[PDB]
Amino acid sequence: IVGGYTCGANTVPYQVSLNSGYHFCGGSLINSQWVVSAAHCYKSGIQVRLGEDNINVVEGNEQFISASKSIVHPSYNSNTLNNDIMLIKLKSAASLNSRVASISLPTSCASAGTQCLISGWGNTKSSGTSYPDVLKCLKAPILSDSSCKSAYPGQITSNMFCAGYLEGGKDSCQGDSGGPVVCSGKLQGIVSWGSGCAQKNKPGVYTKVCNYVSWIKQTIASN
């Protein structure tokens, strides 16, 4: 997250870290046995880490559970990143408590102008590199459809939305993929892609979760 602040230990209880020997993507806990992340984050042998703040230090509230299976969306396109969503089933159910909790699925799509919360352990610099040890947070509004398409001509589909600032300076970044965009207590987005990080007129692009609610509900209940 570039231009953000520090969330505070366990204040974003649904945030998880996908680990393959190292943190590479984020995710969102939707129920005791399921996590939603981005399809481009797929890897075999993923270990999900819940209740984390400082990813380097063991603080006592962590839960490390292996992924039992990963379902990539049937129409995911790795070239265009269309339908960039994936479901990960945990090998064992996570113990829910004050530090580990699920986030609600939306009933309707969010409108332009709505303030959302984006979080992750990704790069904190637009130029260069700096990876945080503690979870970072960013408050950003959903941008209008027109703004998004003009920023990325011919690259925005109906399953994507832009969130951020056209002035640049604040945005999600590498290492934030698969993480949550929560608006009004509901999971509206998934960190997906962008052109650089926090660049002028180049806001982040997120997977529009409201278009996948029935698919998610069906999958979770059938596996």
Partner: peptide, 28 residues
């Protein structure tokens, strides 16, 4: 360009995903 926000190490541009490039050892 289209560059996924996944953390990934690299030795050359070709190691990265989609239109991401290897900027000093990290895809971006």
């Amino acid at each position: 360009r289209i560059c996924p926000r996944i953390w990934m190490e690299c030795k050359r541009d070709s190691d990265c995903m989609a239109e991401c490039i290897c900027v000093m050892g990290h895809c971006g």
